[PDB]
């Protein structure tokens, strides 16, 4: 039911301009739409699945128009999901123009949240309280200030990590990268984080040094040798630069 549903939920005859207009948009780190396709499809998938027993209580309506809205969302953070702020709204605004309007808008910050004992859907933005410091708290090497853009960043991050690929963090110089990877990995108890600087000089040693600080080997009659980690909580090799 979920696949025909996947499958019935996009055609190809919509995705053609979609993936024209990605072609016409600044990409930091440019890589063609035949390469970003894999992120799209396993991360659509991923957030598909991750609700899966949520839709059998929900009508096909409302079924069609929550995987419409995870499939938006994944083709933007993946076509688009390496531009710039005012790049990817454009991107939201063509996605919700060649997709047809019977589906549930995406928006700048749409989000899904649900409670099972009282079923929730739909869009849900700007539901960050704001938090006023005192005086002497001004500056400190310490203080963060959660903002739209930042719980939106630790969201897709998440979303990426749980998909089981790769994720490449690009931004300028005290964009605090690693203070995303680092309030979106703190919060959740199945992800440890072994960061590695990276050098002008750097070779494969260090890496494998650093998996084997937090990682044991094991051998099996099946699959030769294998690298699981000391724990069941999964690992996240951070590597800077």
């Given at each position: ?7 019935d939920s996009f055609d190809m005859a919509s995705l053609t301009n979609i993936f024209t ?70 991107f939201i605004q063509t996605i919700n123009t060649y997709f047809g309007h019977d589906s549930q808008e995406l ?135």
């Open positions: 039911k979920l696949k025909d549903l996947i499958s207009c990605s072609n016409d948009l600044v990409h930091i780190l440019g890589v063609r739409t035949f390469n970003k396709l894999e992120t799209a499809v396993q991360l659509a998938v991923h957030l598909i699945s991750s609700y899966r027993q949520w839709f059998q209580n929900l009508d096909d309506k409302s079924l069609k128009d929550v995987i419409t809205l995870l499939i938006k969302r994944s083709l933007l953070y993946a076509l688009a999901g390496d531009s710039t702020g005012e790049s990817q709204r454009a928006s700048d910050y749409s989000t899904i949240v649900i409670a099972n004992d009282k079923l929730s859907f739909s869009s849900f933005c700007s539901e960050i309280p704001s938090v006023s410091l005192e005086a002497h708290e001004v500056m400190r090497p310490d203080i963060v200030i959660p903002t739209i853009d930042t719980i939106k960043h630790e969201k897709i991050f998440y979303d990426l990590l749980n998909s089981k690929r790769g994720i490449i963090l690009c931004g300028p110089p005290g964009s605090g990268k690693t203070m995303i990877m680092n309030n979106a990995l703190r919060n959740s108890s199945l992800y440890d984080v072994v960061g590695i600087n990276f050098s002008k000089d750097t070779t494969t040693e260090h890496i494998l040094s650093a998996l084997h600080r937090h990682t044991n080997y094991v051998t099996t009659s099946k699959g030769l040798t294998l690298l699981p980690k000391s724990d069941i909580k999964n690992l996240v090799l951070f590597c800077d630069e």
